[model samples]
Target: MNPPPPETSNPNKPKRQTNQLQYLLRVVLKTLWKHQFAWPFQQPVDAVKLNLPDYYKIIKTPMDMGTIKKRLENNYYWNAQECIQDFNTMFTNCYIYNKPGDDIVLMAEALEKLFLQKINELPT
Candidate 1:
């Protein structure tokens, strides 16, 4: 069976500056999501489950991939730089909260490096 057709045309069509930025953001976000180390950063840290008593106290602004995706889907990002800023915040928090030699810290470092490389490819 065929799907129902929409009665109205899409308002957020491609070709505009914002649309182009969103397109590239979506592509890079998807790439990060598919990476092996992505799972650790997928959701907010569960303080209760993880037994981190001071997690919230330590991390005033807890950024996560899930929240980033929500913000992207809701058009909350004004520019590509803001989107990258959020990812950077997430990585920085991981570095701060986890031990220096922790595996998660290592993974975050690797992911951050990859993100920087990919973000540079975004058009100016």
Candidate 2:
């Protein structure tokens, strides 16, 4: 897909109202969460990580990235670059959610506003 027409403010409330892009070394800057992607915004770790194999569907254990990715093949088996990147984002963000801290609930709740919106946009 091509780049979007300068996104809006909130992905939901959006306008990219901040359409201006800045760069170091002329590299185009997208936000921490990209708007152009399907399931835009930071997906929840549960969603980004672990697509369980069959047989475990009744009761599954999330596999590590080591289980999910190609070790020797250069090409994707069933997914793509963004899927791996999403999992990477999950690894980072999930720590914030899982870690115990004084304001953890507040911070995680704030993050969920975006997640919930994107999730709602998905087809059931």
Candidate 3:
């Protein structure tokens, strides 16, 4: 059975933005899980082979994107504004809280230099 929509009556009404941000967070987490800090990590890796079914686990629960968009289009009170605010908050928080430090920065730079050197070896 489908879960109920998220409550929109609260003064904050941050449900919609919160949902999208959470989705992005899961994507990043899955990427890290597969790559283990490797640079140039692509999506759909063996370790984090997520698909629509995996996303549906969260999407089926309280307040999917469709419901949220409908509410905004219908002029529900503070819906659009709250959604934007919540999204900004979530992204800002994630970047600040989850980013790696200078050690990772050095590693990334070294990887870039190595890639350039390897590319130079290929015939043009």
Candidate 4:
């Protein structure tokens, strides 16, 4: 019987390295927000006591929904046609940030339930 041909790398295969960078970027962004921004500003404070300089500037600015949508559109999925459709749906229905006394509690509860449901759907 003839010996099998050796495996060779295919130059035509598309690179998936972007996926790793995307995952790492997300981790870094979340870490910066949690440690240097969100957690520190979590407590209620008097207006005068709010010295925002120590906090990360990104979260300090009032939430700009347009900018958030723009960044997501730019960095995610490379402006694919499907992403445009998704963006329309997202912008119409999504809440970028919840303000105090503004359905935040309900949103948190719903998110907890949704997260568990999603985890359950994932393959073990």
Best by lDDT: 1
lDDT of 3 by residue, 1-124 (tens): 3234454355454334333333333442233324444432222112134323333343332322333334443344333335434333322322332355555444444433443343333222
Candidate 3 lDDT at 123 equals: 23
lDDT (10s digit) by residue, model 4, range 1-124: 2122211223454323244234323532233234322332223222335554422222232321232233442453332232234323322232333344455434434433443343333222
TM-score of each: 0.80, 0.23, 0.24, 0.22
* Candidate 2 clashing pairs, residues 3+ apart or interchain: 7-15, 7-16, 8-14, 8-15, 8-16, 9-14, 9-15, 9-16
lDDT at position 84, candidate 3: 39
Residue-level lDDT of model 2, residues 1-124, one tens digit each, is 1112221122233111111111100121122233233232232223324442321232122222332222102222223333334334433443443455535444444444544443333222
- Tell me the whole-model lDDT of each prediction, alpha carbons only: 0.74, 0.29, 0.36, 0.33
lDDT of 4 at 122: 24
Q: How many times do residue backbones clash in model 2? A: 8
lDDT for position 82 in model 2 = 32
Off by over 4 Å in 2: 1-101
